[PDB]
Design a protein around this ligand. Structure first.
Ligand code: NAP
Ligand code: NAP
Ligand code: NAP
Ligand code: NAP
Lengths: 247, 244, 247, 244
């Protein structure tokens, strides 16, 4: 209702919003007033997004590794809603393996999807933001980017790369009222995590909080950084991990 | 709404007569907390009571005085019950290059900016642990992470705050208490009140000083139910002056 | 002469050793007893390396973006010298631009050369190291990876990615006596830096030491991490930047 | 050889009677430094004189006593000239969960592990600055960066050490003095002397405790001419226990 953390008038683009964290981000940004565009890799996924967003946004099909798709989706957004004010780079995948078993494809698929996508999507929205002297870019990273993790050298390289990209863009655009930050979740209750008894208990053994995080808790950190009130935060990595790692 | 709603929470914000501390106390009150803010003099305490009105009150407190801390906490507990949110904002500077830095300038900083947080955190923790819910939020400084010439004492204390924070976060996370630090960059306050500002501003990509309200916002965020999965963190609010 | 920081018996592979930092690394490792293989992108570069290394190693032509070249060079090394004990991933490039001017090629060339190369080269030497329960992997990163820098979002993403990769591999192989670390130089006196009066004075204005670093100073940090004495260091980033940035 | 050669340097290593401090003093001597190591008792000082032989000597020092520090520094300066390398190794632990942590357990840690570094660094800095060459190397702890339950006091001090380090590095870098921290993980010493070690080891990827010589090596490296471009750094030597 109030003027606090109020995103009325802002257009938000949330990639990979069909479920879990991306869905929670999209839902919360809309609740705080934003016109939200959520993306999925298929039209039926896009349609499921439209359905949960109702009058507060819509779903669009997007492949973040395809520049043609990116250009199509942003043109469509800008026509109806105007320039994107808030970009949330949530889309991402895992292709886990110990290094000696890791395929070239498994490395390159992670680079493309989890790191190079952020370069393309960010580049695609930045001009409009610089022109208006207002913007938010928020990348959904991971505790693994900062901590490292066995069996996820590719994922960790890509997520650490997102931080290096963020800090640099932060410096490039700070004087023009655009912030660029990363939110780094620890282990969050999701389809991915819903693992056998042993594995969950093992990861949980490394969380002081003694539980998995909720997608809503990641959404909240993203909504915070997206807000007018977070204008003096840039180049930051906001860790939301239950104490799994502390920097 | 239910979002970032602190209704039912009792907040203690030290050093709340002006600047960052006042912005924190005001915002926590606006989000529904019952707020007790402190100053070092009774007329300061009164001015806090005055701006809080029915949302809380002002008390006189010296954070380097065990008997003051104990008296203020008994007062708060008697009237409002135990503290749910602790904001350690009170802090000073005693700037000097090391070769000119007096024993008392080192020690005043250790006592006021670091030991105070040990004493106050200890004083509120048992209640938060029994309740299985709590927030301790320390107001650090970019200087704690970046260092700054002429502020080795201040940097030592503010870095120490983070080591303390990480340790306590580990100690109490399983009992639903979070411990975090908000690290302001250069914010327009009395502490920062032409060539010296231009020099500071030259190191801030944002090209401006931060507002006290912007620090308040970070503190309110971490104080919220929604920030329950954040602990042992240092949240930098510095316009890009430093990036970790 | 002594048993201190003694690399006698170790085989070192230093990529991009024809000049500057890579050359200084190669020269120092040889001085400390290592059999050193330095690489360049051409046979004449390789030959210049052979010439400075003399009886303590040789030059080889290597393209770190070509798996065929990598497999050829390691097979050649292993035949003559045995398994690589020390890998120094120094080869790298810059393709600077502000994001809005940055080409797809400029991004992908940096990813390939500065990040994906480390995946390939590391994967190529790790088995032998794990088998012997002894190894060093040392990546030459950059202060930019941790600090960010305007006009170098690609470079910074790749160099930050190297840290995420390092931490993960460090966890994967620590129990098998292999360390994996990064050395992150600040601004070092090199061909790259030998910039106009204004630009050098500008970068120097951000260095408390008030000078550029020497390539030998980077070589020393690498030699330190390569040593038996540094066995309890892994997953670390060793900053050698004159106080430009402090973590 | 000329490599990592400390001939002509005077090194002061506090807390050098055993463990890490002794490994540091021995290695600095082996690399050619004239070494003065300290213990808290004269028989400790004598044992240091005994293992150093002609490479240096042992002195009694309490790093929480200004008059002791001043006496030891005058002794060193009279005989050997001013200190070129300062190694702040002396440190203690006073473990307890916060609710059981006494005032004296907080303060002994602040005085012994943090304020001592202010006093000793201040005592040697003018000489290093005039000479335009110097090394101050603090022995921190992984706990300063990682935190640890039951060690909030120790973590606060060891984190504080790093804030101090970054500030002084900035202050004196232009005059050729470096200030750094080596942060040991769990090292086999008296301080760490079955289930408790297994629990510690379980968090170390290397699957072993560090050796005191491995910390000595890091200290010798940073003490060297070759490390002149390293300042304001924290060098972690922890077997992968933590990775920054
Ligand atoms: N799960 C965790 O515990 C955790 C922890 C830390 C960080 N994260 C990070 O948080 C983000 C979201 O995580 P999550 O676990 O909620 O993901 P998720 O439930 O697996 O969903 C992934 C989303 O990304 C989209 N996506 C995948 N590839 C794409 C592509 N090439 N182009 C466009 N979209 C694509 C998917 O689209 P479709 O719906 O069409 O498949 C989907 O909407 C990721 O960046 C992940 O790395 C997750
Ligand atoms: N401003 C900045 O640029 C900046 C940057 C980074 C961090 N910070 C941190 O932010 C916090 C507040 O900063 P500020 O700039 O708002 O400071 P400020 O304007 O000087 O206000 C300091 C507050 O602390 C109180 N205080 C001082 N000593 C005390 C003591 N011994 N016991 C109890 N209360 C005491 C003061 O009370 P009285 O009103 O009675 O004096 C006052 O309310 C500090 O911890 C500071 O280190 C500030
Ligand atoms: N210069 C600095 O101030 C500075 C600061 C921080 C970090 N660094 C990093 O330190 C490392 C070395 O820096 P530098 O400035 O000394 O480099 P440099 O003098 O420009 O030389 C680069 C070296 O890398 C090799 N190389 C380039 N592309 C290659 C490829 N595709 N395959 C194989 N080798 C290739 C070059 O081979 P050829 O000889 O055949 O061309 C050359 O030997 C780099 O990773 C750089 O990012 C430099
Ligand atoms: N061991 C570890 O796992 C570990 C890990 C991380 C960091 N560290 C750090 O490494 C340093 C040395 O550790 P350690 O394990 O070798 O400790 P230690 O075996 O307990 O030795 C401590 C040394 O400090 C001296 N000392 C104690 N209090 C002093 C005082 N007030 N004034 C002057 N000297 C004093 C002692 O002298 P006496 O011989 O006279 O008692 C002794 O020589 C400490 O700073 C510690 O915090 C150790």
């Amino acid at each position: 209702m109030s003027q606090f953390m109020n995103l009325e008038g802002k257009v938000a683009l949330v990639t990979g919003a069909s479920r879990g964290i991306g869905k929670a981000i999209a839902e919360l940004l809309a609740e705080r007033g934003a016109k939200v565009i959520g993306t999925a890799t298929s039209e039926s996924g896009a349609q499921a997004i439209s359905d949960y967003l109702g009058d507060n946004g819509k779903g669009m099909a997007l492949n973040v590794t395809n520049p043609e798709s990116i250009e199509a989706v942003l043109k469509a957004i800008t026509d109806e809603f105007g320039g994107v004010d808030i970009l949330v780079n949530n889309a991402g995948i895992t292709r886990d393996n110990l290094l000696m078993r890791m395929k070239e494809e498994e490395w390159s698929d992670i680079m493309e999807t989890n790191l190079t996508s952020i370069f393309r999507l960010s580049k695609a929205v930045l001009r409009g933001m610089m022109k208006k002297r207002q913007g938010r870019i928020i990348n959904v990273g991971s505790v693994v980017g900062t901590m490292g993790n066995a069996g996820q050298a590719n994922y960790a390289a890509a997520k650490a790369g997102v931080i290096g990209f963020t800090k640099s863009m932060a410096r490039e655009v700070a004087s023009r009222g655009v912030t660029v930050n990363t939110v780094a979740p620890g282990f969050i209750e999701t389809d991915m995590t819903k693992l056998n008894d042993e594995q969950r208990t093992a990861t949980l053994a490394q969380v002081p909080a003694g539980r998995l995080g909720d997608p809503r808790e990641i959404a909240s950190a993203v909504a915070f950084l997206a807000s007018p009130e977070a204008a003096y935060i840039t180049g930051e990595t906001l860790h939301v991990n239950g104490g799994m790692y502390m920097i």
